[PDB]
Amino acid sequence: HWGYGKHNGPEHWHKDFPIAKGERQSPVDIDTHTAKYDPSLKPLSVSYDQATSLRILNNGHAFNVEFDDSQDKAVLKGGPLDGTYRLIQFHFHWGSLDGQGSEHTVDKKKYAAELHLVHWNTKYGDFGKAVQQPDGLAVLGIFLKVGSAKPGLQKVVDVLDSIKTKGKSADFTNFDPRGLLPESLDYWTYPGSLTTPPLLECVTWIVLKEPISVSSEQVLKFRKLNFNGEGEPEELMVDNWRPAQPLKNRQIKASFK
Ligand SMILES: CC(C)(C)OC(=O)NCCCCOc1ccc(S(N)(=O)=O)cc1
Ligand SMILES: [Zn+2]
Secondary structure, three states, X not given: OOOOOOOOOHHHHHHOOHHHHOOOOOOOEEOOOOOEEOXXXXXXXXXXXXXXXXXXXXXXXXXXXXXXXXXXXXXXXXXXXXXXXXXXXXXXXXXXXXXXXXXXXXXXEOOOEEEEEEEEEHHHOOHHHHOOOOOOEEEEEEEEEEOOOOHHHHHHHHHHHHHOOOOOEEEOOOOOHHHHOOOOOOEEEEEEOOOOOOOOOOEEEEEEOOOEEEOHHHHHHHOXXXXXXXXXXXXXXXXXXXXXXXXXXXXXXEOOO
C-alpha cells in the first residue's frame, strides 16, 4: 500500500489514485511575488475556545490528534470561506533534517515541518460526505521552523512515546489547539486537495504567513516515531511529506499587502 518510501512514495501514488495528476493538487509552491492581495477576503475567524480533543493516534503515515466534531465546538469561518467548518483533527508532516519537512514551500523554501488543522464544511453533515465536495474541507496550514521551543506543543511531544508504532492510540483530552497558532493570522489561500491518498480535490487551503518555532528537541521527538506496527521491522517516521505539485490553472490569493 501507499507510503513515503522509494517503492510506494508520492511518485507511485498516481497508479492507484489517478487524481494525483489532477488539476488542483496540493501542496504547491507559494510564489510570494505572484500571489495577489485580495481585498475581498474577510478576516479569518478561528474559534477554538470550546475545542474538545479526544485522542492521539499513530496511523502509520503521521499522528493525528482527534476532536469531538459532533457539535460546533471548534470552528473556522471567514477568510475565503462560505459557511462553517468544524475541526476534526490536526497532524504534522516533517523531515529527517531541519531543511526539509514542509509540504507547501514559500518561494521554494522548505520549512522543518508543517501543521495541518483539518476542518469540514458543516453543510455536508459528516466528514465522509464533505471530502466528496469541491468545497468540503478547509485546512489551516502552519509552518514550523526550528528555534525556541513552542510551549503549547510540549504536551503533544510528551505523549508520543505512548504511540510509537502504527495502530497505537492514547487518550488525549483537554488539549488547546490555540497554543499552536502564531501571532498573526495573515494567510495565502488557493483551491487544492488532500496531500495524501485518496488525494481528493475538496480542500480550500489557508496557509499562514507566519511560522511557529519549535525546538530541536521537539522535532527530534517527532523523528523517533515509527511508520511500522509493533513487531515489524523498525522504520523511522520521517520525510512524510508530498512534494510541490504544478499550480496549473490556479491563482494564489493573499490576505495581506
Ligand atoms: C473510502 C475512502 C477511504 C476512499 O474514502 C474516504 O472517505 N476518504 C477519506 C479521507 C481520508 C484522508 O484524510 C486526510 C488526508 C490528508 C489530509 S491533508 N495532509 O491534506 O491535510 C487531510 C485529511
Ligand atoms: Zn497533512
